[PDB]
Design a protein around this ligand. Structure first.
Ligand SMILES: Cn1nccc1Nc1nccc(-c2cc3c(s2)C(C)(C)N(CCN2CCOCC2)C3=O)n1
Length: 332
């Protein structure tokens, strides 16, 4: 971990496929920080995702979205093998927290509020995160929450969202909206809302709500709780392979949320229901979720900011863009 004299005394924290996140002590400001060693320069896709994330986190400024404090890299493209991204150290993440801690209703409420407040800003930028999950939600010692990991994020593209049945998808399986498996590329804001719905359900029980073990088992987990889709919702799936697959399944009845979650607040289950709607057109949006009765103690739209400037949208060209996009952190 080659992070210069600014970042002394290191540790051992998190990991990815094309990089790794750990911890060290900062000297220009006098605090411990998080640092992630990214080495993506062998693959086009991973270069694209290092670049997506850098460009987004540098444009974004919001209290519930992780920032970049520094980027450490070689002075020349030639000498640049690794990129080190420095961020505020966060005590934990919601994944780690859910495996060890019962959350009070008051924590659940506050966490959901902050996730939606961060997500309001993201979506106001015309950006989709596309991989929200407990391990991408960071928490400090006083339960302040920041959204991290924008490597699968995209500019929204609802006019190009349609695809065939069983189209491969990249984002984490347990948090995938049912339409992903049926007819959606995940190019609409509704995809993030479904994930948030899943995270909420998981905060209520400490257990993932739809833990599918493979691509199509994911859908059948979803339908086991929501029940069979209605005729109207089925008529919105025009793709015949997808429609006929749903028609081939035995009828399933809705599992009521209060049987699944008998200790949960009844307003939290009302919001859950609206986040985990099968039909993405009927699914609650982020600003309506913030306005829901469950969040009324926190709701303040003048204190839930939006982005000033939204977005509009090979490996050798991408290294040069990564080089150009990290130039501001260099000495000189
Ligand atoms: C102590 N503690 N415990 C939990 C979380 C933390 N503190 C903490 N503070 C600040 C930032 C972070 C993280 C950032 C990122 C994290 S944690 C992950 C989720 C690993 N990630 C993706 C990495 N990519 C995946 C694809 O290949 C390339 C690498 C980040 O960008 N964490």
């Amino acid at each position: 971990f080659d992070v210069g004299p600014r970042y002394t005394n290191l540790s051992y924290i998190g990991e990815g496929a094309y990089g790794m996140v750990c911890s060290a002590y900062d000297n220009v400001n006098k605090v411990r920080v998080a640092i992630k060693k990214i080495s993506p320069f062998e693959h086009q896709t991973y270069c694209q995702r290092t670049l997506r994330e850098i460009k987004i986190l540098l444009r974004f400024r919001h209290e519930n979205i992780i920032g970049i404090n520094d980027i450490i890299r070689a002075p020349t493209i030639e000498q640049m093998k690794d990129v080190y991204i420095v961020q505020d150290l966060m005590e934990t993440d919601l994944y780690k927290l859910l495996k060890t801690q019962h959350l009070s209703n008051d924590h659940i409420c506050y966490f959901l509020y902050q996730i939606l407040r961060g997500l309001k800003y993201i979506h106001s930028a015309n950006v989709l995160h596309r991989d929200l999950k407990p391990s991408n939600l960071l928490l400090n010692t006083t339960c302040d929450l920041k959204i991290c990991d924008f490597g699968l994020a995209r500019v929204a593209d609802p006019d190009h969202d349609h695809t065939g049945f069983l189209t491969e998808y990249v984002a984490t399986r347990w948090y995938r909206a049912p339409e992903i498996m049926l007819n959606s590329k995940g190019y609409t804001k509704s995809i993030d809302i479904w994930s948030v719905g899943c995270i909420l359900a998981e905060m209520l029980s400490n257990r993932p709500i739809f833990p599918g073990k493979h691509y199509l088992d994911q859908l059948n987990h979803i339908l086991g709780i929501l029940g069979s889709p209605s005729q109207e919702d089925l008529n919105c799936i025009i793709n015949l392979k997808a429609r006929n697959y749903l028609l081939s399944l035995p009828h399933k009845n809705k599992v009521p949320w209060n049987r699944l979650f008998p200790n949960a607040d009844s307003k939290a289950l009302d919001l859950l229901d609206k986040m985990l709607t099968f039909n993405p057109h009927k699914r609650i949006e982020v600003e309506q979720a913030l306005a829901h009765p469950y969040l009324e103690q926190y709701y303040d739209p003048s204190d839930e900011p939006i982005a000033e400037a939204p977005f509009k949208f090979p490996k050798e060209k991408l290294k040069e863009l990564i080089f150009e996009e990290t130039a501001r952190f260099q000495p000189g």
